[PDB]
Design an enzyme around this catalytic site. Structure first.
Site, mmCIF file in Angstrom:
data_model
loop_
_atom_site.group_PDB
_atom_site.id
_atom_site.type_symbol
_atom_site.label_atom_id
_atom_site.label_comp_id
_atom_site.label_asym_id
_atom_site.label_seq_id
_atom_site.Cartn_x
_atom_site.Cartn_y
_atom_site.Cartn_z
ATOM 1 N N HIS A 1 0.840 -1.191 0.000
ATOM 2 C CA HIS A 1 0.000 0.000 0.000
ATOM 3 C C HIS A 1 0.881 1.248 0.000
ATOM 4 C CE1 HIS A 1 -3.877 1.984 0.578
ATOM 5 N NE2 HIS A 1 -4.457 0.805 0.712
ATOM 6 N N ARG B 1 12.528 -6.129 -8.175
ATOM 7 C CA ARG B 1 12.663 -4.937 -8.999
ATOM 8 C C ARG B 1 13.852 -4.138 -8.496
ATOM 9 N NH1 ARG B 1 8.569 -0.013 -10.663
ATOM 10 N NH2 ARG B 1 9.206 0.826 -8.624
ATOM 11 N N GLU C 1 10.636 3.414 -18.872
ATOM 12 C CA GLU C 1 9.875 4.438 -18.167
ATOM 13 C C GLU C 1 9.763 5.738 -18.950
ATOM 14 O OE1 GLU C 1 10.357 5.029 -14.010
ATOM 15 O OE2 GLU C 1 11.226 3.050 -13.646
ATOM 16 N N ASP D 1 4.723 6.225 -14.127
ATOM 17 C CA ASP D 1 6.098 6.676 -14.338
ATOM 18 C C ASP D 1 6.227 7.492 -15.627
ATOM 19 O OD1 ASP D 1 7.177 5.071 -12.014
ATOM 20 O OD2 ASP D 1 6.477 3.410 -13.253
ATOM 21 N N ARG E 1 1.556 0.126 -12.117
ATOM 22 C CA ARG E 1 0.634 1.028 -11.443
ATOM 23 C C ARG E 1 0.296 2.212 -12.339
ATOM 24 N N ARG F 1 10.256 10.036 -7.021
ATOM 25 C CA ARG F 1 9.592 8.808 -7.426
ATOM 26 C C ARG F 1 8.157 9.088 -7.866
ATOM 27 N NH1 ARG F 1 12.428 4.080 -7.328
ATOM 28 N NH2 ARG F 1 10.313 3.217 -7.021
#
Ligand SMILES: [Cl-]
Ligand SMILES: [Cl-]
Ligand SMILES: [Cl-]
Lengths: 932, 273, 139
Positions: free
Chosen positions: A168, A442, A552, A589, A627, A757
């Site tokens: 989370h 990752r 990305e 990203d 995500r 990030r």
């Protein structure tokens, strides 16, 4: 006490209409709100309850008409509270919001589907109320596409949905509170059964209040920002909640629908139609707490949980498997197992050879116990003494005896018995294996660059860092084609390099059943993948993980099919990949780099090109969706999003991230879990046989112009504006979020939005109800193409009505706008931003409003979410609770940062502002769920 | 079909007999129904067939719900045939004229079937019906309105297979089954008891229990003193485990090694925390 | 034990220290923790086989065909360098695995237990260099 009359009014003013005829959502929420406020009055006094209720009434009054007077009233009250009352009010509104979410889940679970509401196109697949179930998807493949039943069955056999569960981004809600929430849902559900007796109803109401109070009286702070082991414990809660029983329920339903189209076989129990992966404990990208020991830990913990659940589950199976007629093979194995030396003494003193299935199943139970005990010993100590021959180490050992029982029962015409608990058990073994989830690793590619640079520097070959991309490729290819190792214990290891190598050593020291893919953050060129393949082999990884590059930035996405082609052209890599290649794309990203519209359209094109490459070299391409995607939304939309993916990018293996903010809505409830697994399986099945329409070329050209305009605006605001970062640190709680923690929010503490990030980028703007990262860029793009040609609006609208990709993208933006409020962001500005910086926000908020108005015109809507009134209704309900947490967070931040902001306090209200701040962060976050 | 339920009986006692609610409540407090389970005069049905019968009942019941979808009905019908055939394909003659231990195991099945959950449901209904005549108290939790006794393993009248060892056995088995059920139930109880606000007495006991050195590593690495109810209850869970394991050793050997001070021997030790 | 001996001498109890204590000390020195130190012995041809599988697996040629000076050269570069020699990805026959396993056992036991590694049929320096190398490369 007729306070209940007032909250009934405000709720009915907030959501006046009925979006169906079973719309009891206003009733549910009123019931929960009354019970909660009564508990609040009992526990913390009348003055506190009246204060909280006045705040909520004002917040719903705000979300109705948006009069800023209401915000001024809410703030006027919220600054007069000393820190204690502040904590109470924040806790109160957090829990009320949670109750609202539970009411929503009950409504969704038991809303009657209306067959006369489907339009007959792909738009049906964008809401749960009209989406196709598994059998409707079957019949749709049979009718429109003339696919035969046996073809649909073959397609299903080889299909795989791989759901990746992520930690989370804030509070992974405790396992206990998950159970309490479930109880509240159940009480709420049964209270509205049309057959309950007055005593049943009284006892149900009693249990409901009992549970609500139980939830409010537990702390959600203290201890540590939970260790990744704890976060992982909490993450696996949904297997005990719904998923463990839910998987064989779903699979059996697939069997039924297959029968209902003429298929007489069942889906083979070993077929992996559903699989689960986890990032909890494996994702190290800019996260130092994820150490090698943490990874070993979460692997072992997962194996313990798996063995446990199999152990408890297999006893009932033993009770059911009491037959005596059996196969010669099973008879031989039963007599063979009977030649041996305590875990069923309450059931049978010993299992006789007249119940052979129980004999073999008892041996499996024993081996399961020894597996749990062994993994526990390895976790808590480091060695066992439990003979590995007495445990289960790979899945085939586990499945072999169970399959013996199934075949044997089928030999004697006991096939129906075998299709019972035995079938559900086999299917659990195939879905969950010995680990429940498979861990994905990752890591940044730069860390591998550090390892290889220390390696080459130690060998006096130069510094691998200075070498050009092609020079790196040469060295890595010669080393991979040779058999001579690279390095040994005599190697100068820094802290980071030792962390990387130790990570690989841990991966090699555990079963390959425990791991999924190794994923390279910030992938740019084939040397980044080859580097990981090499380090894997040189860390003595027996069964090496498949290496998956995550492209990305925008230029990386443009360079990606070239890099993947170069990789495919090397014989070593072509032989290692065995005709499968997985590529990861991270919508959030890419949006952080170049704005959301450009990232979306660039990702569609990049998938197309990657498919071209993989078709050139005969490689099966599988796309892993990170995500931020359209496939990461909750519920109905996911269906169309899967249908919308570019043709032949899925190819029988759909891999999606189940974002933490959505996992409760997707798996918290029994029905919700079934319909989630259903829409994933059905959407994958259909997309494999019915690709979305290929876009008209004018659409592609238009999207190319729009991408240009959008990225230009986005980068001119985020990166080129010098005084942007200052505004960002004022108008947004990003600084406090990083300082508090959750993990680190910056790769480099001293840099800029580039090194920030993606998750904190999305979060920081989500908290203020502004969502800049999601909509910035759409405005100037839609505006520009409408000005360039009057008719272009009609083209955009055409796309929104006919091109699935464009519809799902615009729809997501629409939903995020439904969650946005420029006035709340303006309040944050008024409290935390310098006056000379005020116009900066002002202009930005203008861009908000205009983009909002532009999105509507594309969708042909006059209001927001005009085509999905159920979701509009629910978000409208939550926003009234979240808004109070907004005002409270803004004023709390003004109070933390400026001790020169004194307020005339009010006397404390009946029986450290940072705790308040964390409460508002968790609350707002939990209420807004997914944005971008 | 026409007998009085608990509340109709309440209303008859209050109306026709002019008995006050207080009197009914005291009478209930001091009342006890002691049901004595006796061995079956022929076949004490195996526990597996009891569970199969339960499933058949459940399928039959859900098949006639006035709200079930065609797929649910189809799958229920299949589950019913599956269970009927499952029952018919087990032998019930072979092996031994069940050892009295086996007959007793089969007799205790009904505690797992309905009784273990059934007792507190009934008691709670007593509370509700008492509220409906003005009584604000609940029936005291230690008051034994229901009790169970067993003759399985104790009746020797003209039955030589009932030896003293058989009696020792069923006593130890019963203590084991009890310890098992208490152990499994107290897990969910621990998940529920996540409060922090607590009594001075309970705070003292929580800090005291925290002064010591394995059965909750899948849930919590360790239970902190900020969840004191979970501390006390976790200790009780531990004591239950040691009780079950001790009785298991006494049954299977004749001795243990489990210190009797780490188990529950009498009910007051159990109830106090 | 030596502390005890020193102590007894401190108090003029040297005659006592030269009794059972002295015999014990001398037994500890003579026999150590193992009584005997084990000597290992193996033919040079078997080490040649191991190195042949190693060089063949590295596609550098076959160590068996190489001249004595070519062998010496290769073995010396390997010994002065810092890059290891081979790994798990190595086709091991029964004898080759036997030899390497012997070295692994030697590495996993105390050095108090071992004496000398002895090369049967020794003929030229490459055989000695070969054993020294395999020793270093089996850790
Ligand atoms: Cl741990
Ligand atoms: Cl596809
Ligand atoms: Cl027994």
């Amino acid at each position: 006490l007729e306070k209940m009359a007032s909250i009934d009014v405000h709720l009915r003013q907030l959501v006046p209409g009925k979006v169906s005829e079973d719309d009891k959502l206003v009733e549910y929420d009123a019931l929960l709100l009354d019970r909660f406020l009564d508990i609040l009055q009992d526990l913390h006094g009348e003055d506190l309850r009246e204060t909280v209720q006045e705040l909520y009434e004002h917040s719903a009054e705000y979300e109705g008409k948006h009069e800023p007077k209401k915000l001024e009233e809410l703030g006027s009250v919220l600054t007069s509270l000393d820190p204690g009352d502040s904590i109470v009010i924040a806790k109160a509104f957090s829990h009320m919001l949670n109750l609202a979410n539970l009411a929503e889940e009950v409504q969704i679970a038991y809303r009657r589907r209306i067959k006369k509401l489907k339009k007959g196109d792909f738009v049906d697949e964008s809401s749960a109320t009209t989406e196709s179930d598994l059998e409707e998807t079957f019949k749709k493949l049979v009718g429109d596409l003339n696919k035969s039943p046996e073809e649909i069955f073959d397609a299903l056999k080889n299909q795989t949905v791989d759901l990746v569960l992520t930690a989370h981004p804030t509070q992974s809600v405790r396992r206990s509170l998950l159970q309490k929430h479930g109880r509240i849902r159940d009480c709420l559900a049964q209270l509205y059964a049309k057959d309950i007796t007055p005593d049943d109803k009284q006892e149900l109401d009693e249990a409901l209040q009992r549970e609500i109070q139980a939830a409010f009286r537990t702390d959600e702070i203290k201890r540590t920002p939970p260790t990744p082991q704890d976060e992982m414990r909490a993450g696996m809660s949904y297997f005990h909640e719904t998923i463990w029983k839910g998987v064989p329920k779903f699979l059996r339903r697939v069997d039924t629908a297959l029968k209902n189209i003429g298929i007489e076989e069942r889906v083979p129990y070993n077929a992996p139609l559903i699989q689960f992966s986890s990032w909890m404990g494996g994702d190290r990208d800019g996260n130092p707490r994820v150490t090698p020991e943490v990874t070993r830990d979460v692997c072992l913990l997962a194996r313990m949980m798996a063995a446990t659940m199999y152990f408890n589950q297999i006893e009932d199976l033993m009770f059911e498997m009491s037959m005596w007629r059996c196969n010669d093979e099973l008879r031989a194995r039963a007599d063979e197992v009977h030649a041996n030396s305590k875990h069923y003494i309450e059931f049978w003193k010993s299992i006789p050879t007249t119940e052979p299935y129980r004999v073999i199943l008892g041996d499996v139970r024993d081996k399961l116990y020894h597996t749990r005990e062994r993994a526990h010993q390895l976790l808590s100590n480091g060695h066992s003494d439990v003979p590995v021959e007495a445990t289960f180490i790979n899945l085939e050992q586990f499945l072999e005896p169970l399959e013996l029982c199934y075949r044997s029962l089928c030999s004697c015409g006991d096939r129906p018995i075998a299709d019972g608990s035995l079938l559900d058990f086999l299917r659990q073994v195939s879905t969950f294996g010995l680990s429940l989830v498979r861990l994905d690793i990752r890591q940044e590619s730069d860390r591998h660059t550090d390892v290889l640079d220390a390696i080459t520097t130690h060998l006096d070959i130069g510094s691998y860092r200075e070498w050009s991309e092609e020079r790196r490729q040469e060295w890595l290819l010669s080393e991979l084609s040779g058999k001579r190792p690279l390095f040994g214990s005599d190697l100068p290891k820094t802290e980071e390099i030792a962390d990387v190598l130790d990570t690989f050593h841990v991966i090699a020291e555990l079963p390959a059943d425990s791991f999924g893919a190794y994923i390279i953050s910030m992938a740019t060129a084939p040397s980044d993948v080859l580097a990981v393949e090499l380090l894997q082999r040189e860390c003595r990884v027996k069964q090496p993980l498949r290496v998956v590059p995550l492209f990305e930035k925008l230029a990386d996405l443009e360079a990606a099919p070239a890099a993947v082609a170069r990789l495919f052209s090397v014989d070593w890599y072509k032989n290692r990949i065995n005709g499968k290649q997985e590529v990861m794309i991270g919508y959030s990203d890419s949006g952080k780099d170049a704005g959301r519209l450009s990232a979306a359209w660039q990702l569609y094109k990049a998938q197309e090109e990657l498919v071209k490459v993989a078709k050139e070299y005969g490689v099966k391409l599988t796309m892993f969706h990170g995500r931020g995607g359209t496939v990461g939304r909750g519920g109905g939309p996911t269906h169309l999003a899967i249908l919308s993916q570019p043709p032949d990018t899925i190819n029988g293996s759909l891999r999606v991230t189940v974002q933490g903010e959505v996992i409760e809505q997707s798996f918290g409830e029994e029905h919700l879990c079934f319909r989630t697994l259903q829409r994933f399986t059905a959407a994958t099945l259909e997309h494999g046989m019915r690709p979305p329409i290929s876009p008209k070329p004018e659409w592609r050209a238009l999207l190319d112009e729009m991408a240009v305009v959008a990225t230009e605006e986005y980068r001119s605001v985020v990166f080129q504006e010098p005084r942007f970062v200052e505004y960002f640190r004022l108008a947004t709680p990003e600084l406090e979020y990083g300082r508090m923690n959750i993990r680190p929010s910056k790769r480099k503490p001293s840099g800029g939005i580039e090194s920030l990030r993606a998750i904190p980028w999305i979060f920081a703007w989500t908290q203020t109800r502004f969502h800049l990262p999601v909509w910035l860029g759409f405005g100037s793009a839609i505006r520009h193409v409408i000005e360039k040609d009057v008719r272009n609006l009609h083209m955009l609208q055409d796309m929104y009505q006919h091109w699935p990709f464009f519809r799902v993208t615009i729809d997501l933006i629409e939903m995020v706008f439904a969650k946005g409020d420029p006035g709340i962001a303006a309040l944050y500005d008024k409290l935390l931003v310098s006056e000379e910086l005020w116009p900066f926000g002002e202009k930005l908020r203008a861009n908000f409003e205009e983009t909002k108005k532009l999105i509507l015109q594309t969708a042909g809507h006059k209001d927001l979410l005009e085509g999905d009134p159920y979701l509009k209704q629910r978000l409208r309900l939550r926003d009234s609770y979240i808004t109070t947490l907004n005002v409270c967070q803004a004023y709390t931040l003004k109070r933390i940062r400026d001790p020169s902001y004194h307020v005339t306090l009010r006397p404390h209200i009946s029986k450290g502002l940072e705790d308040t701040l964390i409460l508002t962060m968790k609350g707002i976050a939990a209420g807004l769920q997914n944005t971008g």
